[PDB]
Structure formats: structure tokens, C-alpha cells
Symmetry: C6
Subunit: 293 residues, 6 copies
């Protein structure tokens, strides 16, 4: 039984934060893709193009969709572009089941990088042959999600319409001028755009997601018999630390690990009830976390 | 029993719109090719060269011909040019049946791109060896359709005769000056030219074809128990939207999907009789489609 | 029983027109080659170098010789130069029979193109190793015919002797200065030169050959129950049309096909005795061919 | 039973000298990695980035960790970058056991060398695909330690904070400006930095380690029945000799071998109790080592 | 039983003309090589370096030696330089018999071409590894003959000693300055030099050799029942014709074939006793050869 | 039973002349390497770096060591740098015995050539991976001897210390500045240096070695029943001849062969007691060698 786009967007809220619009677009595009396959067509390729800054959650979204639909997923990088190698990999994680491999999803990262603005354009066209569809499996059935930051894109759109509000006005012609070929863009009808993650959102990233850092460590400490408590001040501190380094959400783990290093070192050598991480432990880094016996 | 060129052109009208002349040329060229094969020659290679703007329907035509004659078809891109790889692929979709693979059709896209005006010319000659004919299958039997936009071609013809009226005056020498070698052009006797698709034709593209967008979605909505109605105003609106973006017919799906996004999102969560898409839903994009219970 | 050079030249007159001298040279060279093989040598390599403008009939001659002697034939292009690949191909069309593959003929096209005037010279020498002879088959036994237009050749010969009369004065040293290495030319003792095909010869090309265009179409129409009649005016018209385009004999089919397009389209939908193609049908292209019921 | 980070750092003191902080960081990072694997996650990649001058003991540390945890180890050089070849090698030393190969450790040397400040960045991204995880083994499970000297790094950090004290202030953004891509650095949360080895430490290097030079030779002489005695003066002499040549600890063996050459030459031809190496034997090199019968 | 150098030089006189000195050098070098092998060494590599103008008979000599000693022979071109490929080829013509393949001879042509005066020097060294000796066969046993024209060599020798008299003064240092590496020249102890073939020698080339042109054709005509007679005037005429074209002995066949073309054409269509070729038939080319019934 | 360094140096005196110091260094380094292996370590890699002019006897030494210890030996050229190919070759001459192949010796020639002063440095590092140790055989066990002339080395050492006396002052830092990477030099602790062979030594080279030229020929003549006598004058003459050509010891065979050519030619055709080579036979080359019946 296929999950309504509602159920899809709902489950996406459990792994990714914000980007509600993009999650609606993806939810619909996805539902329609598998709704179209399960009825043997008779229809739209329904291929998707994700346009959002780095560390916005594009890859996470693609993966999440795959899991939510218990469907064979595989990544690939447009820079390393062998095109059929992606397919054999999809079969590898699919137990070599042709049909289940056709229901699969394929995420291509850094698409904006192959925009000729020779070999690059050649890749667009070579990969394009897949998008259409031709191991004996056909690539017509599999859904394609093409991520990318598209740096210069924010500019071309502005030179026409006259960041989020600007990416909403995105048009296929903007992608053309950017460096993508028409025949390639025409294969990516569904364009979902993500916003740059907010700073408070950072805190939500450390908390809300079912795989948030705090939850992982609270679990690591949990199998130690110890309860880890992150005070909101500490979480805000981590957010700021991450912003000052411009590392976005990618530089969150590098902060938490460094903050809980000493504590995780001599933790198994202790007997106490819980450890409490205050802001003083993060920002200053000089103060040791509160210990409770 | 071979279908008369009439039957062929007739069935081509069911997938492609306009290009009636090109469909006559293709119909004849095709009929003669398979009429020549089924009589074991004793004759003309009867190979075809499609010359039309991008998104004119060249690829669609080639595919359509293949299906109409239940004959093994395969594409290939002149830019990615391994030459025999195309053949093995033709055998892949042919169940490795030598004879049926010889009856096959092969479409080569972006031929105008390999026109030297070194490696490019080398490809013309390498691919030329196939056109003639030499797995054990011979490539003499298979029909070759070479598509291409031929941008500069419109110019050279003008510098001689002194867009459609100009492409009709096309001559093998024009292709020579364009960048094609004589021995290669002499293998493509049949030259069918397509016109740039008209704007009203756009509307016909959304309606007439048996795989038109409207029909696909009406079907997607149909298995939902809902009847989708496209008012002509909405279709004209879509046409205009596509023209303003210069994306031609390639930018039609990107419009329809965006227009039916919200509706397809919360459709499975509703119970009503039919949805009616008005022009207000397309152009303005602000108005939601009419809902009927 | 080996055919006397007379019988050979006689049968060559049935496929190729003119080039009588070249056909004498080839006839002798060929007879001597197979007369030398059938007696296990004890002798001259008797390898041949064809020098004639494009579309003169070099390839046709080579093929014709092969068929006339029921001997395994295969082509190859000096531009695509893997050298032993030609051999395996010769075995492919020979049922992998070593001896019959040694009796084979090998035509190398565009030899004049590999004349260094690095890699090119390297090909001359690599291919030279074959010419001498070394799968287990030896390439000493097989006859080598190396075609080529040799554009600049007409000039060097003139700078020495001081087009046909000039190509008759051809000397190994002329080929040296052209761009061929001595050790390579010394392997091609037999040099047959062809003349540029005459305009009236064009008409003869449309008629005389046993595979002439007129005969093929008269046959295509023949299995339709219809008799096709080409009036000499129409044939002369076709000749002129071909000359104005400088496409030589390569641009003949492209004319005839275009002329019989409409007629072949609605032919199977008619019931009449014969169609007669007049000059008005070719030159003007406006007049439809005479129809007789 | 997993060894507490204490036990880990303790055993690391038996092979590597100094770098106590780095050994704490590595100990924790390691303990957490295998503590996370043995509980089937539910967590942090816990990948490590070693930043220390050449001959600081980075490679030694990685190897030591591997042995201490009886886990399949393999090296690889970022300059020679085939990416999956490292994996097959890890399987080679793992008896092709998928699970045990997933518990493995992989050290990548000269990471600072691939910092683009095209192909280099491509390697970062290609290797990045491994770090994440995709033979059928998944590379997500295996721990990655990326060594490197990072010459210019000492500078960029200084241009921000305004050698050890400077490397302690290291930040992900410093690595960014250095030449590493964000998505790559975000995969290396754990950053352990080593100091340039001290000169007295040199003496400790010749003595303390369980594989110290003195111990090896004392053993080589030991199976000769002879006791080798290194006087502290000789060890200090060796230290100085090594410093004057700037060869660091890499130029220690080249000194000891040269010092014990003559003695090891005519040793098996003697009968005595022990040989004693004085400073006079090292610095001067003129004096022969004390011999005792 | 090994043939004395006398017997060797004697048999060499039956295929090659002149170059008596070179034939003495080769005879000795060869006798010593196989005299050294048949006694399992205990000695000199006894490798040979042929230095003579093109078409002097270097390749012919090497081949002749091989046949005379019923030993597996194979050629190779220094320009096409895969090094072990030569070996597998030697095994191909040796029935894959290791020992008999070790007794083999290997001729390398155009050695003077690989003289660096990067890749070239690399080939010298790569091929050098063979010369020394390392399929399981060892290349130490096989004799190496390295031919070459060495154009500039005639000059360097002159700049030192201060063409035949000059090539006799050849020294290893001359080859060094020419472009050969010392370690390579030291592997070619035996240096045999050939003179530029004389013009009267040309006539001897057409007569004396057991494979002379006259003998081949007299045989071709012989199996026709006809006796071919070459008058000395005709042979001298052929010699002159060849000299005027500077094609040396390589341009002899190209003359004889052209002279006997017409006659060999209508020969099988005649009944007569013998044909006699006079000078008038060659030089003038206008007069037909004398026919006798 | 392992041979004491004395026995080793003693046997080395039977093949190589002079270089006594280098033979002591090699003897020790070797003894220690196999003394360390036969005791399963517990120790020093004990890898060797030969530094001597071309034709000094580096390769000869390496080979000699291998034979003396009945251990699998194989060469390799740093210029041709596939790295594991050397290993498979070592297994080829080792009957594919893993253990015996680990006891093997590997000589790398022209190491000084790969000194970057990109690909070159890459080879140093790739080959470095072997030196350390990782077919299933480990390369840690096998001994590595890296030869090389190191031309510029004589200079850098001079610019520091302020040819033999200079090469004795060699230091790892000198090799660094030369073009070798630290991590590579640290793997070659044992540095043995050879002197340029003396002119009188040349005579000793023709006499002393158990494979000296004189002994080989005296043996070649010996199986002829003839005694060959080299008068010291002739040997000195050969020495001078070799020096005038600067070919060193590499140009000795090229002299002796040329001197005994005629004599070896008509030797098997004679019956006499002995031939005596005087100086007149060598220098003048005009006088024939004394013959005694």
C-alpha cells in the first residue's frame, strides 16, 4: 500500500527539519512516480532536481525517501563522472533483483558542477541516456534525484526576475544559462528548492531529528548506565560555535566530539548517575561537564 | 504483411504532430527499406538523415517507427563517440536474435555535432563503416536514422540558394560545407526535414498525441477515481508559459507538474468527483483548481 | 581453375565502368598472385596500390575482384589506425578457415591520408609488418590492395615530369615525396590508377552496371507488378543534377530517391501497368512521372 | 572485551613516545568507534585526522592501534590516488572475512598533499564516498585515519588566531582554506595533533619503545651470545648526529648501522662476553667499541 | 652439427650479394653464439648490431641466418615500441617449445630511430632488460640482431677520425654521441657494417640470388610452359631505371612488374615457346617483348 | 648455516674486484638481514643503497650475493616505473614458493634517476610501500638493493663537507637535496659506495674474475682443443683501448671480440696446438695472432 504524500511528508519531518515546501514537492513527485509504476504506466518521468546550499539536507532527504519506501537506494557523484556502474551498485544492494532494482532511487550529487559555462556536457548527455532508460534492467523505471548547490544560479535568476524567494522563481531557462543542456533539464520536471538552514534550526538539528547528535550520545552514554543531559544553553553555544566557523551543520559533530572527549575518556572508569553538559563546557571548553553521583 | 506508407504516416500522426512532409519521406524510406529486405535485395541503403530543431520530434519519430513495425530499436549519441557497442545493445533488446537484430533501426543523435568545420571526422568514418556493413551480425541490413539540429546549416543553404523553406532547399553539398564528409553523406540518401513546432501546435502537443500530457495526468487522476478536465484556456496558458521561457515543448511537463503539484499532494486525502484546471490555475498559479464533489 | 586475366577484366566490366587500364593491371596482378599461391611459390608479393579520385570505383573494384574469385574479402580504413583486428574479421567472413583466409583479399582505404608530409608513419610501418607476413595465420599469403585519392600527388608528379596522363607517369619516388616511406612503397609493386569518372559515364553508371540504380528500382517496382522506364533525358538530367552538386556518383542515389519518393509512396495504393520517368520529373521535380494503366 | 581508553593510551606509550594528547584523542575516538560498532549503532562516524610533522609517529600510531585491537590494518597513500583496491587489500590481510574487514582500520598518508590550493579534489571526493560507506563489504563500519604534515597549515591558523600551541587552535575552517573541501572535513570529526619530536626524546626513541633500535641490536648481538651495552653518552651522541643532519628520527638507524658495521662484520669470528658502545665510537667514529672477554 | 663460419658465409652468398665483411662478422658472431649455447656456456652475449643504409640487406641477412640454422626467427620494429610480445611471437613460430625458442634469433629494425639525441631512451632500457635475460623462457639464450641506417652516424665518426671506409672506423663512443646509452651498446659487442649496394650489383641482385626477380618470373612463366629470357641489356636497363628513381633495390620489382604486365596479361591466352625481354622493352617501355613460337 | 660476513666478502672477491669497503658493508648488511629472518625477528630493515659510477659492479655485486646465498634474485629498472610485477617475477624464478620468495633479493637500478630535483616522486613512494611490506607474499622480508650513479651527488656533498673520499662523507641529507624523499631514504639505512674502476683494475677485470673475458675465450678455444694465451701486453693494450673510448669495462668485450674475430672464423678449419695474442694483435689490429702447431 502506497503512502499518501501526507504520510510521506510526515515521516520526512522526523529526519529533516524545515524545507517543508521541498518535502511537499518531493512527497508528491515520489508518490506519483511509484503510483505510476504500480499501475504499469498506461506518463511523466517525474524525475527530481534538488536545488539547495551545501548541508541543507538534500542527500539526507533522498536517503530518507528510500528508507521510508523500503526501496533500493544508491548515491553517485557527478564529479567522478562507469555510468552503468551506478546500476550494478543498485543491484548489489538489491540482491540483484531486476524488478526491485527498477523501483529503486538514484541520487546524483553536485550536478551543478558538470554545467559547461566538453567532458562535462558529455556526462550530462551520457547520464541523460540513463534518465530516459535503455545487466538487463531498464533505467526508465528508476527515480532520479539530482542534487546540487548551484552557486551562480542565485545570480542568473536575479538578472531575469528583475535567496529562498529567488530560488522559488527558478525557471528551466535559468538552468540553461547556468550550464545545463535543454534535453537534460527536460528530464527533470520536478524542481524542489531548499533554504539555507537557520541558526536556531541548528539547535533543532541537534535535537529534533531521530538521529540528532544529542540522541546518539545520550545513547552512547546510555549503554554506559549514564544519563547525558544537554542544557539548551550548551546547544545554543554549539550552534554559535558552528556559525563562527561557517562549517554549517557539517561542523556540529566536530564540536560535540571535542566537547565530550575528556568525559568519554574517563567515563568507563567512573561510577555515577548522570553527566550534564552546560554552556560553560562548550564555549569556554575550560569547564568540565557537571557530574552527578 | 508490410504496412503501406499511408498506414505508416497515419500511425505517425497518432504520436507526432505536424512534420507531415518528413513523415511522408520517412514512411516511404522505411517502407522501401523493409520491402527491400523481405525480398532479399535482388538496391538502395535507404538510410535516413533527420534535420530539425531540438525538440522537433526527431527522436520520437524514430522510436515511433520502431514500435509501429515491432522492430528492435536502440539510440546512440554522436557526442559519446565502442561503435559496435550500439550493436550489442540492439541484440540485448532483440533477445540476441541475429536476423531480427538485422531488421532493427538505429538512431544516432547530434550528428551535426561531429562535423569538423580530427576525432570527429574519425567518428564519421568509423560509424561510416557500420552504415555500409561488415557478434556475427551484419550492419548492412539495419536502417540508420541520423538526427541533428544543424545550426549553421540554415546559413550555408542561404549563401547558396540566393527556416523551413530554406531547409527544403537542402543539398548534399550544403552538408559538405557544414562539416560532413562526402562518403558519409552519400550513405544518407533520404533527408527528411522538420519545422520548428508551432505555438498552437503546443496545445495540440498537450492534447492530440496518444501520450499527451493531459492524457497521462487524466489517467493518473483516473486511477484515483477523479476526472481531470483541462479547459482550453488552461492549455493555451500553458502554451504561452512555455513560449515565454523558450523551453519549447521540453518545458511543458515542468509547467503541468508545477500546476498540479498541490492538487496531487492532497488528492488521495479527498473524496470528490472531478477537478477542473482553469487558466487562472496556470498563469496566475495563485488560484487553486476547481473542485467538484 | 584460375580465370585468365581476360576473364577477370571481362567480369570487371560488368560492375565497373571505364578504368580499363586499371582493370588490366588489377587482372594481371591478381591472376599472378593466385597463380603464385596455387603453386606454393617455388616470387613477387604482387601487392596493389590503387590511385584514383574519390568515387572512382576503387572499393567497388576490390570487392568485385573478391566476389569474382569467391575469396574472403574485408575492408579497413587507414584513418582508424588493432592491425590484427582486420585479420580476425577476415576469419569471421571465412568461417575461421586458416587456408581460405590466407587466399583472402584486404582493401585498405585512405592510404594517402597516413602519409607524414609520427603516429601516421607508425601505422605505415605497423601495417607494413602485415604486408610482409608473420590466430596463427600468416599475412604473407593474403593480397593487399591499398586505395587512396592522393590529392597532392598530382602536383609532385608534375614538378618532376616537367590528371590521368600525369598519374600514368607516377613513380615510387613521387609517393616518397608525397609522404610514404620507401619500405612501404616497395611492398606495393603494382600501381593501378583510375581516371575521374566522365559525365556521360555518369549515365552509364546509372545504366550499365549490373547493380545500376535504374536496375535496382526497376526491380523494386517490378515486384510491385509495375514496369519502370527511365527515359535517357531523365538519366542525363540526373547526371547534370549530380555534377552541379559536385557529389560525383555518390550523389546519384540521393537524386533518384528524391525523384521517385512521391511515386513510391502511393504506388502500392494503385493499379496500373507502368510508370515512366521523364526529364521533367527530375530537373523540374515539379512534374509527376508519367503513369500508364 | 573492549579496552578502556586508559588501557589503550597505556599500550600506546609502549610503542610511541610523547604525543600524549594525541594518544588520548585517538584512544577515545577509537574506543567510541568500536564501542559503537559492537552495539550495532542504535551515531558518530568517529573518523580521525592526524596532523603532525613527518616522522612524528602518525603511521606508527595507526599501526599500533590496529595491533592493540587485533584488527585488520592496511595503509594507503593519497599521492598514488583504485580506491576500492585498498578494500581488497584489507580483505587480503583479513582472510576475506567480511565482518572482521568491517572492523578494520585504514590509514591514509599525505592527505595534506591532495589539497587543491582538479584530480586532487576529485580524489578527496572519491575517497569521501568510502568514508561514508557503500566485494560486498560496506566501508561505513571501518575506521579511517588520515595522516599528513600540513605544512602551510601552521600559517593559516596563525593568520586567524591572531607550532604545537598553534596546531591546538586548529579549526575545520583552517583546513578549508588549506585546500580541503567542507564535505570531506565534516567526515573527519576527530583531529589529533602531534608535536615535533624532541631531541632528548630522540634518546628515548632509541631506548623506551619496545622496538627501539638499542633493543633490536642488543637482540641481534644476543643471539650471538654477546651482550651489547649502549652507554648514555653514545645515545646522546647519536641524538646529536641525527639533529645535525636534520633527518629527525628517520636518520637514527642510518647512524647506528654505520656505527656497528665493523663490529657486526667480525663479530661471528670472535669469542668474547660483551661489546660496549661508547660516545667515542659514535661521534668520532674512529674509536672501535670496547670489547670484553 | 654446427656449420663452420665458412659454411655460414658460403650459404649467405646465395641470398645476399656483397657485404662480404659483414657476412664474415655475422658468420663468426653466429657460430660463437650457438657454439656457446650447445656447450651450456661454462661467455659472451655475442649480440649483433647491423649498421647499413636502407635496402642494404640487413633484414634479409637476419632472416637468412635463421633459415640456414633452422632456428625460430621473428622481427620487430623499434618504432612500434609489448616488449614480451616479441617473445610470445617467437613461441608462436616455435610451436611453443621453450628450448627451441631460446635458440631463436630476434631482429630489431630501426634501432637508430630510438636514439635520444624520454620514451625512446626508455625503450632502449626496456629492450635492454631482454638483451640481458630474465611465458617462462629466458631471453639470455636468444641472439639479438639490431639493424638500423644510422644517418647522422656517418657524421659523428667523421668528426672523430679526422661512407664504407668511415663506417669501418665505427666506435662504441660514436654510437653514444649518436643517441644510444652506454649500457645498451655494451650489450651489442658485434658490429657488422654494410655498404651501399652498387649499381652493377643491382644487376647481380636481379640474377645471382636464389630468389632473384628474374628467377621468380622465369618460374611464373615456367609453369605456363614458357621460357622467359632476360637479356643483359634489359637487366642493365632495369638497373639504370632504378637508379634514376633513387629507389635502390626496393624499386626493382616495381619496374619488372610494369615491364611484364601486358605480357603476363595475354600470356595464358597464347601458345608459344618463349618470350625474350630486350632493353627496348624496359627503357622505352614502348616495344613489346620478343615472342617466339 | 649462514656464512659469516668474512666468507661472504671472500666469495665476493672471486667475482668483483676492488670495492673492498662496499663488499664489507654489503657482507654485514646481508648477514644481518638473513640472520634476522632466520630468527623470526624478535629489528632493522637492513635495506641497502649502492652508490657507484656506471659499470662499477653494482648489478654484479647484487647478483653475486644472490647466487652465494642460493636465494631467488630479480632485477628491475627505476626508469620503467607494475610495482608488484617485480614480485610475480621473483615468484617465477622461485617456483612460486612464498617463503623462499620472501628470502629473496631485489635490485633496483637507476634509483638516482627518479629523484625529483611528480611521477618520479610518486614512484619513490609507490616503491616505498614495497620496501615497508604489505600473490599473498609480504615484501617486508625481502632485501632491497637500490643501485644508482648519482651524478650530481658528488657536488652536493662537496657543497656541505667544505670522488671516493667525497662519497665516503655521504649523508642522508645529501640524498635529500639530491632529489630523494626522507621517508624513502630512511628505508635505506645501509649505504655502500663504490669507486671508479682503475685502469690496471681493467686488466684485473680481464683476468681475475672467475668469469673474466680471457677465461671465457680460453674456454671457447679450449673446447676447440686449442690453448689461448693472452700476453700481459695484449691485456694492457685492451685496457688502453677501452680507456680511449671511455666505455669503461662495458667496452671490453667489444674489443676482445673484434680482436679474436678473424681467428675464431678460421679456427675450426685448422689443426694447431695454441694461439697466442700479443699486443700487436690488439692495438695495431693489423698483426694476426701468433699461431703454434
Amino acid at each position: 500500500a502506497l503512502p499518501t504524500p501526507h504520510e510521506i511528508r510526515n515521516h520526512l519531518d522526523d529526519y529533516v527539519i524545515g524545507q517543508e515546501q521541498a518535502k511537499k514537492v518531493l512527497a508528491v513527485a515520489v508518490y506519483n512516480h511509484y503510483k505510476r509504476l504500480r499501475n504499469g504506466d498506461t506518463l511523466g518521468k517525474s524525475n527530481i532536481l534538488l536545488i539547495g546550499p551545501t548541508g541543507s539536507g538534500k542527500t539526507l532527504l533522498a536517503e530518507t525517501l528510500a528508507r521510508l519506501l523500503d526501496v533500493p537506494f544508491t548515491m553517485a557523484d557527478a564529479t567522478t563522472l562507469d555510468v552503468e556502474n551506478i546500476i550494478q551498485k543498485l543491484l548489489q544492494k538489491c540482491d540483484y533483483d531486476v524488478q526491485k532494482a527498477q523501483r529503486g532511487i538514484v541520487y546524483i550529487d553536485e550536478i551543478d558542477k558538470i554545467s559547461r559555462k566538453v567532458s562535462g556536457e558529455g556526462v550530462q548527455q551520457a547520464l541523460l541516456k540513463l534518465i530516459e532508460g535503455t545487466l538487463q534492467v531498464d533505467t526508465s523505471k528508476i527515480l532520479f534525484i539530482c542534487g546540487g548547490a548551484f552557486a551562480g544560479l542565485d545570480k542568473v535568476i536575479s538578472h531575469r526576475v528583475e535567496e529562498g524567494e529567488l530560488l522559488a522563481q527558478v525557471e528551466p531557462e535559468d538552468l540553461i544559462k547556468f550550464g545545463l543542456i535543454p534535453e537534460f533539464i527536460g528530464r527533470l520536471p520536478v524542481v524542489a528548492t531548499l533554504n539555507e538552514l537557520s541558526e536556531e534550526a541548528l539547535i533543532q538539528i541537534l535535537k529534533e531529528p531521530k538521529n540528532a547528535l544529542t540522541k546518539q550520545y545520550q545513547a552512547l552514554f546510555n549503554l554506559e548506565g549514564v544519563d547525558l543531559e544537554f542544557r539548551d544553553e550548551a546547544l545554543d553555544a554549539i550552534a554559535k560555535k558552528a556559525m563562527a566557523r561557517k562549517t554549517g551543520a557539517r561542523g556540529l559533530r566536530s564540536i560535540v566530539e571535542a566537547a565530550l572527549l575528556d568525559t568519554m575518556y574517563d567515563l568507563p572508569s567512573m561510577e555515577d548517575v548522570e553527566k550534564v553538559v552546560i554552556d560553560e563546557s562548550v564555549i569556554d571548553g575550560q569547564s568540565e561537564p557537571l557530574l552527578i553521583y
